[PDB]
Structure formats: structure tokens, C-alpha cells
Ligand binder design. Sequence first.
Ligand SMILES: Cc1cn(-c2ccc(C(N)=O)cc2)c2c1C(=O)CC(C)(C)C2
Length: 208
Amino acid sequence: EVETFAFQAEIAQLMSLIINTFYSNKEIFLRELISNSSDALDKIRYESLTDPSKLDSGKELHINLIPNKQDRTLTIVDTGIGMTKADLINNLGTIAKSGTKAFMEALQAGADISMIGQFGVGFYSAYLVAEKVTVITKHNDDEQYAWESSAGGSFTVRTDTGEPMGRGTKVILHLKEDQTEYLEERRIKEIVKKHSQFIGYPITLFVE
Ligand SMILES: Cc1cn(-c2ccc(C(N)=O)cc2)c2c1C(=O)CC(C)(C)C2
């Protein structure tokens, strides 16, 4: 069973702004997704200090960057806290609504798209380079889910029947035809070094 949901008006507005605004500094999407992964890793690591059994789903705390030229996808994998069904459908959307309002107000005042992470809606920068985003996630307190959206005001959520993850999140970016530079090893290495050199978890860039 695939469930279809409407994005709240503010989020659909944010997605349309990211997709339609002329902005050449698209590379910032990677630091934003790595930041989401780092925050998720900090959360599971902190929770594990009071409850060590929270790491029974996997002790390794890392980030993997996987390019796939055949599928035209860039995948950001983390072994962070993951997201529950409630996080995917309601909780993150609630914080995203207030974050969007503040971001769009800041943009009107003269701020640029690269400041998106300060408003906690950095995940949506994925739409600067991706025509579709698939999010596979597994939280300790819930099942493995697949969230997906090609924007257009809707997203889907289904129980994932793919390879079991243990715990964490996979953000699969189905890249736009003209954004294939983000599949090149030297381009990804350059972006990681420039914006994510001090992330407190190992970042492994997979090769093809
Ligand atoms: C806000 C927000 C933040 N994140 C997000 C993305 C990734 C991670 C992680 N753990 O790697 C954490 C949070 C999402 C949002 C959304 O509205 C849409 C979403 C629920 C599909 C994703």
C-alpha cells in the first residue's frame, strides 16, 4: 500500500522557489544533507550514552556518499537515529512550516538560498539538483519506510521492502539531466573539502 499526502502550502511554496529561482551555487545541497546526517548521528550517539541497547541496530556511526552514473543517482547514507512514520508525515513538516516562513521572509530582506540550513529546512536544497528525492529510513522505534517526492505538491510514504538497513537514513537524489557533475569523484571530493571538512563522523566517498 502506497499512501499519498499533500505538502502543507508553505512547503510546496518552498519547493517551487528552490526549483524555479535562478541560483548557480547549487553545490551547497551536499553540505545541507551531510549536516542532516551529522545531526542524526549526534542524536543516536547521545541517546546511546544513557541506553547502550540503542546501538543494537548498529554500532558504526558514519556517512557514505554513493554515486551511480547508470541510475543517475547520488545517495547520502548515514547510520543516524533515522525517522519514524510520524517524523516523515507530521513532526518534521510542523518544524519545516515555521522554518520556511522565516527563510522566505529572510530571502525577501536580502538573504541568499545558501543560508537555508539556518532555518532547519536544508533537506529541501536537494531540489536544487534532484528532479526526485527518495528517502529510505529506519528508526529503532518503527519499521523501514520509503518517502518520495518529485514536488508538484505531493509526497508518498510506503513500508520499504528493499535491503534492511539496521538503522539510519538513505537520501537518494535522482539528479536533473544537467546536474551529472555531482556524480564525479573529483567534484564530490572538492565540495566535501570546501563545506564539510570538520564533520565529526567518517565520510566515505564510494567510487564507481
Ligand atoms: C525538515 C526536514 C528534515 N529532514 C531530515 C532529512 C534527513 C535526516 C537524516 N536523519 O538524515 C533528518 C531530517 C526532512 C525534512 C522534511 O521536511 C522531509 C523529510 C521528512 C523527508 C526529511
